[PDB]
């Protein structure tokens with residue numbers, strides 16, 4: 001029900017600054033732990 | 049932890065920069081309709 | 097009776113009308129102290145730090161006049 | 173500590189709801205007939221001394237923290253004849269009215285929700301022989317303990333259960349020093365389909381099927397003093413979840429859990445006897461016990477001591493229980509307190525369970 005406003009933080013003001021930090025991850029079929037910020041992988045075999 | 053996977057708390061984002069503030073990859077520096085020429089479709093939700 | 101508890105989104109805002117908050121204790125349905133602020137002395141409280149493994153959590157606040165009031169809230 | 177506890181839905185069906193039985197170490201399958209004898213053994217409702225009775229019982233949860241979080245019970249029994257009796261009980265565990273606020277405006281309509289869990293059951297008890305009786309009970313259990321939010325459905329989960337009970341009470345037999353009385357009872361409870369809280373047939377939880385077998389003896393002195401010593405054994409009829417593994421590393425656990433969850437309740441009742449690496453010596457561990465002694469003076473004062481012990485490897489709820497009961501004219505008031513003796517924090521500690529029963533109607537003689 002809220003109107004679509006170009007104001008995400010709801011401070012009534014639309015910020016136009018672009019000062020941020022950028023992180024990235026890859027999405028590949030053969031990802032493994034130890035690289036690409038992967039810390040754990042859980043495999044499930046028989047899912048109903 | 050601060051939970052950030054709420055569906056209703058995310059909204060359509062602005063055109064980002066991929067390398068730096070001088071990186072015109074997705075036409076983020078454009079001041080015309082070309083600013084939005086690289087926006088592909090994205091649906092974010094939680095299955096009801 | 098003077099307090100307006102509110103849980104908007106992962107936060108518990110506590111406001112005491114015409115009184116001063118002394119201590120706020122937050123309990124889960126198990127009875128574990130998931131949060132404790134022994135020293136505030138302010139009208140407005142904003143926890144915004146609960147883990148809340150369940151939904152219903154119990155908060156107990158006492159004012160400067162030692163008014164133990166407990167109000168069950170659902171974590172959102 | 174607790175190794176592989178049994179994961180069954182609606183656990184509140186296994187919690188004592190009346191002060192009298194809770195003061196006896198949570199046993200009522202072999203004690204004297206009373207109005208509260210619906211959760212434990214309806215088969216002795218035919219042995220009740222009065223025509224009809226009603227009872228309200230209260231068990232507070234987290235007394236030190238807040239009120240309105242409690243388990244209440246309303247029971248009503250009525251015997252039309254000396255051989256048959258109809259009873260009906262309603263247990264309700266609730267956290268009380270909880271307001272939902274997301275705004276600090278004083279003028280703001282607040283939605284009030286009460287996450288609850290109730291079970292309404294009705295039982296018919298027929299006295300087959302002069303000293304033996306049977307009873308069949310049907311129970312409907314609904315759980316609405318969740319609050320509706322975004323991407324979360326608070327639809328209530330409902331299920332049905334069938335209870336079969338039997339109670340034997342011999343006549344007053346005289347001995348060298350006293351004229352005691354023998355009682356025995358068995359009860360199979362919560363026989364029904366799985367209850368699914370997620371409303372999905374793939375994710376369904378077994379009802380807490382239970383088997384209680386109890387026996388007791390009453391010593392009678394001076395015709396106005398009674399001492400009833402009773403012992404009850406309780407065992408769940410649900411298969412034990414797999415532990416380390418019973419066939420990579422997580423694949424065995426996943427396969428064992430999938431095999432365990434893909435078991436029908438009818439098959440699971442029979443699979444309860446076993447399904448573990450241990451033998452009969454380790455299978456005896458699954459049976460919890462409760463021993464109680466109740467002293468009755470003038471049929472108006474009751475002092476109850478009880479000791480309820482579960483296995484340390486499952487449940488681990490060992491405690492003592494004190495209880496008192498007073499009947500003025502037709503109203504019996506029962507109060508019970510629990511002294512925990514286990515390493516786990518019992519949620520019933522520092523809780524004085526209460527019960528209030530009104531008995532009315534004609535009086536039936538007891539054989």
Ligand SMILES: CCCCCCCCCCC(CCCCCCCCCC)(CO[C@H]1O[C@@H](CO)[C@H](O[C@@H]2O[C@@H](CO)[C@H](O)[C@@H](O)[C@@H]2O)[C@@H](O)[C@@H]1O)CO[C@H]1O[C@@H](CO)[C@H](O[C@@H]2O[C@@H](CO)[C@H](O)[C@@H](O)[C@@H]2O)[C@@H](O)[C@H]1O
Nearest residue numbers: 223224226227228247248250260501502530531532533534
């Ligand atoms: C699913 C449950 C349904 C609810 C059952 C309520 C039954 C109410 C009957 C009142 C009662 C039971 C005590 C119940 C109290 C528990 C209340 C719980 C409150 C919880 C917070 C109290 O009666 C006692 O209390 C006294 C009141 O002070 C009475 O005094 C006097 O009281 C007044 C004259 O009686 C005077 O006006 C007052 O001047 C006096 O002082 C005394 O007569 C007596 O000691 C007496 O029961 C008797 O009344 C009849 C009426 O038809 C009932 O008929 C039954 O109805 C159906 C049964 O439902 C059955 O189907 C039906 O077969 C059966 O014919 C029987 O029961 C009967 O035995």
